[PDB]
Structure 1
Amino acid sequence: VMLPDGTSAYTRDGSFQVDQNGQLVTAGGFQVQPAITIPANALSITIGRDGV
Structure 2
Amino acid sequence: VMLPDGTSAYTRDGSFQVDQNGQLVTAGGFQVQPAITIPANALSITIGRDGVVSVTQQGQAAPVQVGQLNLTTFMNDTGLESIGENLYIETQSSGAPNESTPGL
Relative to the length of structure 1, the TM-score reads 0.79
Over alpha carbons, which structure has the higher Rg?
A: 2
- Count of residues paired in the alignment: 51
Residues 22-44 of structure 1, C-alpha deviations (whole Å, 9 max, x = no match):
11110231000111111122212
Q: Runs of at least 4 residues of structure 1 off by over 2 A?
A: none
Residues 6-51 of structure 1, C-alpha deviations (whole Å, 9 max, x = no match):
1111111121111111111102310001111111222121102121
**Are residue 28 (structure 1) and residue 38 (structure 2) matched?**
no
1:2 Cα shift? 0.9
Q: Distance in 1 between matches of 2:31 and 2:11?
A: 12
Relative to the length of structure 2, the TM-score reads 0.45
Question: Structure 2: any 5+ residue segments left out of the alignment?
Answer: 52-104
Q: Distance in 2 between matches of 1:4 and 1:48?
A: 26
Question: Structure 1: any 5+ residue segments left out of the alignment?
Answer: none
Identity %: 100
